Amino acid sequence: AMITDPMDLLRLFDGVQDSTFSLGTVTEIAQKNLPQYNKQTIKNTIKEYAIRSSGKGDLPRKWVIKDAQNWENLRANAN
């Protein structure tokens, strides 16, 4: 079960991208902006579309939305 509404995904991506936090924390922050969804749905959605860079730098360890093409498509529809 995942977030499915484009506008909601756009809100999720914006707060996930470049975040330096744990999954539990990024999830809880997101649930405040998206109060209708449960944590497991938000986690599922983050683990589907995002990835946590290991730095390995020196590093900030951060969240990246993987498919920049997709993010672009559904950023186009809303506008």
Question: Determined by which method?
Answer: X-ray
Distance of CA 19 to the CA centre of its chain: 9
Using left for φ > 0, alpha for ψ between -120 and 50, and beta otherwise, residue 59 falls in: left
Q: How far apart are CA 52 and CA 20, in angstroms?
A: 9
For the chain, the domain total comes to: 1
Q: How far apart are CA 42 and CA 65, in angstroms?
A: 14
Residues 70, 46, 57, CA angle at the centre, nearest 5°?
Answer: 90
Domain hosting 75: range is 1-79
For helices 6-16 and 39-49, what crossing angle results, to 10°? Answer: 70
Q: How far apart are CA 55 and CA 77, in angstroms?
A: 34
The data reach a resolution, in angstroms, of: 2.8
